[model samples]
Target: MSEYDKYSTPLSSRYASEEMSKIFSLRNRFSTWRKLWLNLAIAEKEVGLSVITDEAIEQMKQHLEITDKEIQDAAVEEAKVRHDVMAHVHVFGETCPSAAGIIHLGATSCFVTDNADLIFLRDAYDVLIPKLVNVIDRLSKFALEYKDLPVLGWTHFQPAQLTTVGKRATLWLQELLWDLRNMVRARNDIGLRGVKGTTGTQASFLSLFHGDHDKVEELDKRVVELLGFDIVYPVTGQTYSRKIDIDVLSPLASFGATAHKFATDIRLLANLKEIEEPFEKAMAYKRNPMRCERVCSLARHLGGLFNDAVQTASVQWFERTLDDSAIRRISLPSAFLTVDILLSTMLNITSGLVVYPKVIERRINSELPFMATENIIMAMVEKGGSRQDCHEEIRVLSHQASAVVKQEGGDNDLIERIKSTEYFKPIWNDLDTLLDPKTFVGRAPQQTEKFVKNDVANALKPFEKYITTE
Candidate 1:
């Protein structure tokens, strides 16, 4: 797409639509600005303050059909004025002269920006949230299906214990579901900036209605009604509240962070060639040229974007400023889009997840000696063995496991070597109860099934219509 063509592509396309790209894009942005301007005129007129004509308002609404030329010129104008709202107002006025008079009546740039942000965010939550719900549902399903399957659990990149794959999936699902709850709460809490002018004092609005506070209040209500939002912000400075972006963006970032964690885990799993994310069939070989085991390139990219959003959020200033605007404009939507893509890739991977049960079993068995050490230590204690003796014995076994996992040119045959030893004889009894490895996964599958039946099902009820199954 060329410069002008870029405008037609839609913001959601650049990021990811199942994310918040479209909701926060320039097209939606201009549309809301027009609505704000039109509503401001109608509300003021209803309260006996008629500065803008209906014909002018209609023309202003027409200006909502923006041209690339106008937006491009506005960008240039903004460079000169160093103010975005003023630039758009200048461009908009050129198309709708009558409404232009009332365009900024009793309002500042934030009067439009903050309220427009509400519309944008609300639109995003309405569309993007269900996709998130679907992801959580898939995750829960995977957790339950594989809950009892033993796998090596890692700490500091070394096998530290044996756990069920389902348990790990549940850990990720819990974090994601928690974030979804936060996203929903924040979506509902969004407040629009009332038709307040600069400084949020509504000085101009008071003067317009001759100091009639009731008319001002009534006007605010009308504007809120017109905008389809339940609440007009009770107070604001230049913006509705920075917390709006902070709250919204933080959840998206959390989504990204979680995606990264899952992706990194997938990458590690892929290294073992035990599992893999869905790859683009046509380009899989060429795109993922690395041929690295336990790696999903796309997931890695998504994870990187998630970290970027967190970094962007860390720089927000007090109350309201332009500090986070530029960063959020990129970070918020991009983070959501990337995460959505990651989940899409993940779901496909899960649906067709290539699980080598034998490899998984072998991997779990490989780590069983070390994992069993903890249980063996306890058993030894019960048998009247000194605590120090048990501790030293288990600690040595753990160190040996770590060295083998790290492949430090040390003994790679520790499992067989230990099995033939005197210490192994006493500890053999502990394995009678704990050595199966798969049996140690504590309630993972049940938790997954419960989450799917309860949390995922309940969350998805509102969005079933959007779902399609092939």
Candidate 2:
């Protein structure tokens, strides 16, 4: 409610956590820049570059802290020259006069810009992966808890078969498990840009080391070590490969897709009165799946972000291009923001998901008459009725029952109508066994138990503490 606040995105204002928002905040970003410069100075000194002094490194370390005034100063400088990296460099130079000349030496804008971005992505993954695991954990509990709770299953929006509520949750859980794997792999595989100079050639660093190629190489290795990364991209142009953005964002988008599917399913189940997302009150008309709705809405946005990352990577002009910058600033942060909200919302919804077993049973009862026809036909065949004759009898009776339900607005009487026919009379005694909803679910409950025990338990084995044992 301040004068400074005008337009605000829901991503930061409502959905995303303060922890993630802080990662990309001004203080964190510039402080990271300062760390990279200090590391570079230290590495240069270590590689026998006489011009870079240890005293300067110590001075720079003393003044590495970022403050509000420093951010304002950098903004002022950036407004003047229209280059943010140089603006912050000038600000850093002002802080440590002893290290002023050596700060960011033998480096291009990408030195801090791209390297900081890689670091941000790595840290963002660190924040989100655990949340993803927690989501899986909650779902594992939900899946096992409701593993035998029968619910109507649908294909093409028409009731087709039965699946336990827990088994259905496992379907949602499995997609997220795949997404979790992709998230961890992408984070682990991300490499720092290192200290590649302008235009992919280390000309400045090479000159600094007096054409000592090994020391130039060693410089990059040392800086990467200081930055908490084991792998540094051995080759780069103006920046690390844009493909890295694609790789990282793709899994985020896949997660969005999975979340979307789960949300959509919840909405559909809510409509059928079989299940619901958590509600404010139990009143019939007051129920709102607001969180699930938000998940679908944010998911759509996150999915579009992957397209931005992929298209930006696809059109890079040889080594690098400026075209990618504007998009990355928006897409990268937005993807993470939406996904952060998505997982948090999913965890909330899944943990408290309400099931209406009686309602689920009623809906299944409405559809089971149609679905159990095949079982009746099989039973009829086994009871010495002509398979072709029994099939025709079912087809005719099914239409009659359909007309009663759809056109006449009556409950399905397919079973009663079938019992009236002579062809099915021989098998009518066994009809109740075939008509049981549990028989139609096949192995869904067992499958859920097996999957949660083997696949999900193994996937989450190392991170078991993050999972709720309850």
Candidate 3:
């Protein structure tokens, strides 16, 4: 407690919701430590340890909640012993005097440290899964809502073809689907450290069981059962493998990548006023999408953390090392909190996303005429004219209009130029008929419905339980 003693992280306090902030909070973590202690006793007693009495179990159950005063005392103990787990164990013992001897019995520091860490992360997954599902669900509906509205498609930052706005949304949704599946796959495959003893040999538990191997494994299984999980790592170091962080945080970072793409797209589209979210003005006419920009900023930081994670896992010594501990203490929870806000912002933008159809059409009308020139060429040939002759007339006329629009700020006079010519007089009336914006957006509407109704629906089916009701 020196140097004014306040270093605030804006992530949980400023960005992430309380649901996520609590998952990584001291209250949740320390209480989980208490839970891990209780569960270990339950498993040991079940495995025939008579020292773990129901009285001790009941005492611990009543005192599981760790408060501000308890944390301060634990902090003081940590400063004295220089061991965080032991300090908490001591404070927890002071609270549960009868269960003091049984607390964290026959286990290493990791029994509570690593085990509770995993429990908190798994609960973090629960909070995020529904949020991800909800974003995907909202996007699925958005794609269907605008699947038929043709908009200008830009390639290489230049207008090229026509595509429906909804079809474009499908592209955004597709990337999110990949992000969703990556997280779900990672979440589903999560394994607990279980009751692995010091250095993961379960040597302490083995001695406690009096050399009975079966009961040691049984104790591991029953603790995991009480925790409501099925999978436990068959082997671990003094702690579970550091690579598990890589497994969990990697997808979360990849999701940051997805968020970057989505936010950047919205920023670009917002430039043309085709799509935008919320706004407040300062320059009398200037509006900004600050949330999307915040999404991008946080995403960059989140994606950058992936390298730290990889480096932490790569440098782990034989069984374990202490270096990764402090690094993980900050990086892991930061990753979740960053993503929590990113996804919350995404859900906000997607659910209330505003698309300006008239702006989309105005942009399309400017460029659709040039793209439809090819159709004009085909139409003139079918209307009893020389193919080469009509192509020659339109080519020269197009550049004239292109120059007028580019240099002179003139309207698209390609139509004006063509209509004034006798070579294109035969099909003058057919220009509007052929230049229909819908004509160029081939299969966009059909593809949006098909992709959203079937592919998106199927991908989201398994996570139906995680989808938010709202």
Q: Estimate each model's TM-score.
A: 0.72, 0.91, 0.96
At residue 456, give the lDDT of candidate 2: 94
Q: What would the per-residue lDDT of candidate 1 be over residues 1-470, giving only the tens digit for each residue?
A: 57755564333454244435656668668767877888888887878875667787677766776688888887899999998888888878876777766777777777787788777777767665766677666667777788777777778987766667777787777777777787788788886788777777788888888999999888988898888888888676666665566666666656655666776776677677666655544334322213222213433444454555555546545445567577656655655555455555555555555556787877767666665655666777777777787677667767776787677754444455446567656655455555677566666557666776787677667767766442
Q: lDDT values of the candidates? A: 0.68, 0.87, 0.87
Candidate with the larger TM-score of 1 and 2: 2
Q: List the residue pairs that clash in candidate 1.
A: 267-294, 270-293, 270-294, 271-293, 271-294
RMSD of 3: 2.1
Q: Which candidate do you rate higher for lDDT, 1 or 2?
A: 2
lDDT of model 2 at position 315: 91
* Model 3 lDDT tens row, 330-437: 898898888889889988888777788898888888887788877999999888888888888889999899999999998777877888888888899998778889
Which parts of model 1 have CA positions greater than 4 angstroms off?
A: 1-19, 50-63, 69-94, 97-102, 155-157, 282-351, 369-438, 458-470
